[PDB]
Structures are given as C-alpha cells and as structure tokens.
Amino acid sequence: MSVTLHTDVGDIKIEVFCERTPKTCENFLALCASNYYNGCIFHRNIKGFMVQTGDPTGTGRGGNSIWGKKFEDEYSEYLKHNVRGVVSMANNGPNTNGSQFFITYGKQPHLDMKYTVFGKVIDGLETLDELEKLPVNEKTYRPLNDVHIKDITIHANPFA
Numbered sequence: 001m002s003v004t005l006h007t008d009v010g011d012i013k014i015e016v017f018c019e020r021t022p023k024t025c026e027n028f029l030a031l032c033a034s035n036y037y038n039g040c041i042f043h044r045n046i047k048g049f050m051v052q053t054g055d056p057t058g059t060g061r062g063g064n065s066i067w068g069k070k071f072e073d074e075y076s077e078y079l080k081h082n083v084r085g086v087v088s089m090a091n092n093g094p095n096t097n098g099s100q101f102f103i104t105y106g107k108q109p110h111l112d113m114k115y116t117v118f119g120k121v122i123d124g125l126e127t128l129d130e131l132e133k134l135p136v137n138e139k140t141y142r143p144l145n146d147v148h149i150k151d152i153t154i155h156a157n158p159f160a
Contacts (some may be wrong), residue, residue, distance in 0.1 A: 002155035003032055008147045010127030014087050016119040021074040024089055024118040024159045030066035031099055041146045051131050054100035063099035070096040073116045081108040085121035106134050
C-alpha cells in the first residue's frame with residue numbers, strides 16, 4: 001500500500017488508497033511490480049499545476065492497464081485534489097484509465113470527479129519541488145532534459 005518512485009532527481013514516496021479505489025490500486029501496483037514504469041519520463045510538467053508520467057512511449061498518448069483495456073473511474077467524496085502532492089490517474093474522458101498518472105503541485109478543485117485520485121505523496125516533497133522547477137518547452141510543457149523513473153520500490157507491509 002506504499003510505493004517509492006526512484007527518479008533521476010530524487011525519491012518520491014506515494015501512499016496508495018486500495019480500500020477506496022481497489023481497481024486503480026491493483027492496476028497501479030501490478031504495473032509497478034512488473035517493471036512497466038521503469039524508464040518512463042515525465043512528459044508534461046506544468047508548474048503550479050501538475051507533473052505527468054506513466055507513458056512508455058513518452059508521447060502522452062500511450063500506455064495501458066495491466067489488463068490491456070482501459071478500466072472505469074473510481075471517484076470518492078473522500079479523495080480530492082485539495083492538497084499539493086495528490087496522485088491521480090490521467091484519462092481522456094470517463095472510464096479510459098490506462099497507465100498514465102500525474103501528481104498535483106497544489107489545490108486543483110476543478111479536477112475532482114473527473115480524475116481518479118488514488119494516492120498521496122507522504123515523503124520526498126523536496127523531489128516534487130525539484131520537478132516543478134525543471135525548465136520546459138514553453139509550448140508543449142515537456143522538460144528540456146528527460147527525467148526518468150529509474151526504478152520503483154513496493155514497500156511490503158509486515159505480514160508475508
């Protein structure tokens with residue numbers, strides 16, 4: 001239920017909410033566990049708004065769920081883009097969730113009920129600061145230099 005993203009500019013620990021968003025959880029974890037994200041870049045980085053990643057093709061149009069078919073949204077009145085560091089699934093319309101996800105840089109209430117929030121950054125906030133600071137192509141918002149997710153670590157919760 002906890003994950004760490006090992007990026008080129010630091011580590012970012014994300015806590016996932018499996019109980020509220022179980023399908024989004026299972027998917028995210030399956031992809032992390034199967035090295036799907038290893039190597040992805042952050043293709044869209046919009047200061048004061050959010051950073052996006054999870055697209056193996058790095059174009060912003062690729063990526064797919066562990067099922068190979070987009071799944072449904074899992075909204076919750078409890079989960080909202082109201083604090084900096086909220087993690088959600090990107091989509092191109094209702095129920096078109098694949099593998100891309102993004103991290104907010106601050107409150108973005110106009111995203112609630114449109115994107116599935118499934119996690120939060122609980123450690124590595126300075127890394128978020130690094131990311132938001134990267135120079136981008138003013139027209140496409142793609143960083144001048146590629147920033148990848150090197151590896152991912154899934155924190156096992158004492159059991160087995």
